[PDB]
């Protein structure tokens, strides 16, 4: 009788478009796909994107731990890496490095994250090289 | 077997 009540609130929170409040419940209910859809929906909305990192601080400790293991799967897929990288950026700058070591499964999390994140950096480097073609077009326009 | 099952 508990989950169906929690599910009813989660089904509600999506309906009035309250994605910020939906972050806590979906992480607590352990739905990685639901969180991923909400994270994408937050970023497209302009005002919600800036208040994203403020929300992440208010979450308790264990929600951030299960959240971290969600980003491991998301960073694997190229279509889903950008939403993962934005989230992983928040954890690094906000929280203390020694506290990151205190997390459970952080050692196993670091093993998977490094190779796939290295792949994304090389792809963006090639795009930056291709972006220089705009400067060549500007000088050749009359 | 009895007729009660089969017929009735």
């Amino acid at each position: 009788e508990e989950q169906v009540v929690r599910q009813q609130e989660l089904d509600n929170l999506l309906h009035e478009k309250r994605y910020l409040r939906a972050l806590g419940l979906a992480i607590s209910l352990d739905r990685p796909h639901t969180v991923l859809t909400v994270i994408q929906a937050i970023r497209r909305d302009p005002e919600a994107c800036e208040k994203l990192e403020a929300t992440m601080l208010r979450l308790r400790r264990d929600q951030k731990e299960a959240l971290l293991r969600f980003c491991v799967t998301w960073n694997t897929n190229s279509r889903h890496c950008h939403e993962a990288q934005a989230v992983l950026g928040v954890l690094l700058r906000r929280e203390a490095p020694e506290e990151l070591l205190a997390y459970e499964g952080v050692r196993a999390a670091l093993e998977a994250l490094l190779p796939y994140t290295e792949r994304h950096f090389q792809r963006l480097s090639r795009t930056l090289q291709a972006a220089a073609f705009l400067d060549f077009l500007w000088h050749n326009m009359k | 077997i009895s007729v009660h099952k089969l017929k009735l």
Partner: protein, 828 residues
Amino acid sequence: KQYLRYVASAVFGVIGSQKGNIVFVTLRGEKGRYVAVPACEHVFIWDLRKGEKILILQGLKQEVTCLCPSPDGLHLAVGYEDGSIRIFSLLSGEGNVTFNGHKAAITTLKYDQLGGRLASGSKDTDIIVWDVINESGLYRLKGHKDAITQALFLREKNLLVTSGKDTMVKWWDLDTQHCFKTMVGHRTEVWGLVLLSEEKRLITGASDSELRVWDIAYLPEDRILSCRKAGSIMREGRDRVVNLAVDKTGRILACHGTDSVLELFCILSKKEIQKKMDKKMKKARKKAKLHPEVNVEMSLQDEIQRVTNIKTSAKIKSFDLIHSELKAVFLLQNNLVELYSLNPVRTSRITIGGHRSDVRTLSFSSDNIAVLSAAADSIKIWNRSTLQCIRTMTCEYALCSFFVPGDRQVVIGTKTGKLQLYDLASGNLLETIDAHDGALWSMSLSPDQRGFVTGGADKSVKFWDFERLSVKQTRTLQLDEDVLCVSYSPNQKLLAVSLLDCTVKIFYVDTLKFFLSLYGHKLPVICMDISHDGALIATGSADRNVKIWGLDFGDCHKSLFAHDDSVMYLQFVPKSHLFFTAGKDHKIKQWDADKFEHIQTLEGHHQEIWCLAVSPSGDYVVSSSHDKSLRLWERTREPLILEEEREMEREATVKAAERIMEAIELYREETAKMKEHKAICKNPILMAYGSISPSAYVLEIFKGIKSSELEESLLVLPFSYVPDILKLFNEFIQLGSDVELICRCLFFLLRIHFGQITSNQMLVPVIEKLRETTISKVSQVRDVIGFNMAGLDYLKRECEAKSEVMFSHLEEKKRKRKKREKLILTLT
């Protein structure tokens, strides 16, 4: 060799089916005079005072499951086991509206107050709301997980509340088709749900003695409404709640369990509640003089009071209430409807018109005018044409019965070893003969008008003759096992009996000597019949096969599959070698004994068929089934051709490049339209994707394009659409959405149209916005990933440092190494 078709003429002997609900109807301005009762595949309108059928509403091949009368009174909604919903006009008697959204039996049907919307529940876990006036289905609700028990509208805020066989109560916002509130209180099925006190209290019935109530107040935070546990009221019945009903605009709440008694409750509201509270306070003040919150608590518990409960003869299936004195109509397992009057006394019954149990034996008179049907505790005689019960006699039980050649008398068999005889005119039992020790199973009439033969559970077979009418026993024939069927030849030469062992033994009538034996059935033979010539005898067993045997030598001509279950009865037509059989597979079939062919199938009944009878003229056939109904079939003049009947059962986008063009054109048109609309202040495709900007709609078109087909679609696109795409691409990068996809598309167009872009001076502003945006956004994304370099790499080194402290060192080094060796395939 041409055959003739048999067609179902009428259905009789049924008052009310066990499944369904009884409803009061308004005809000719009399609210309580007429009632609507469900039968097998039909629904009947009865007059309680007169006792006759005013009107019958046609059905099609499927049983009716539930009934709902329209608020206006002109229409009544009908639900079927298939899932189709049909609405009938009472005055015309013809229904032309069909709703077939559901895929299972329609459990409930309810109307709103106005009558424009209809809500239906089914065993499939769905609720569908229909537009009655427009004859269309509005929307489907899919929240529930089990069968739907109840569905009720709310007038005040356009809300629907539903209950199901699952332990949940769900609240729906019909405007958005969203389930906003769910109750999890109950432990078991929520069988009942009613609204009371002007939609301020909620009452639920479950499979327990306690009956819970909630109070609702309009406005995990609650939304729209809130509900609190007001309390519970006790029930006398200890069983499950079958039904909860409240009469329209009344103060009477009726609770019904599996037992026969119906429980009534009366609510106190408005001044009556206030007057009772004032009286209680004065009595409390008098008690204080002789020698409050408790008084208020006493008032709350006494808000609803128990009036005297109605008791019925048998258990009730459905009931209805009307209040101007309370009138309550009932439907029982017996096809019997009763009305009781209370402010209890029984005012009327419609017990005439059907047997109280399933008809086990069935017979015709010597002429075709009369039809005999007998069951447990009742015997009735039916006129074939006029179709009303001529006379009724009580009996101990019915298993077999023949009609004596005299038109005045009848003879029946019983489960107890007895025989009873009656006159039709006198309507009394003549005498009772202890014919057999055990159950008497079969009875056969002599070819000549004198005498008859009985066989039964007692292993002997006894011969009787007629002697005011009386019967005496001439001689008896004793056998080794039980006797299933006795039937002897159209000439008085040969006698055929069926035993419990899988054999049919033929005896000479004159000498009582063995003549023949028929074997080969895996299961004992239930039914037997002998042709008019006497050449062929057909035997049917509990095993599905039916076999034809010749009397001359006992040779088996044929064995047929026939029904899918055990065959119950078999009988030849009088004129020719055609016989009718009925089995437990819901069917009646006729066969040609000479050609061993299946000619016809009658598909009227909905349950297993107990008995069958054919007229001596052969024109009419009557059958009885587990469903409490009797059906009549008649021969028609239209010829039947076999192979024409045999075939009756056999019968019974746009390319990626073009998509970009339409998206751009749609964007061009709308931006002009919004410009005009704003000036006045001083499309359907967009709502299809949800309300979004026209610039947004172009984006998902690009996302929908497959990666492989991306490059040639851009090559195909003409330069006319290119400047617009560059403006739209700039808008995409600034939002930051799908930058990798857009930049890959953007860089391709610039290369292929490099020369033409350079010439056009109109594009000079465009790339200046593009040049500043593109590098700024791409660098930002790369920096975010690049910042993750430092944090992850540093945390990697810290974990490696901790492992160094532990380094037993060889064991730890071996254990540490062992983790980091993955395995790959290699062709050596």
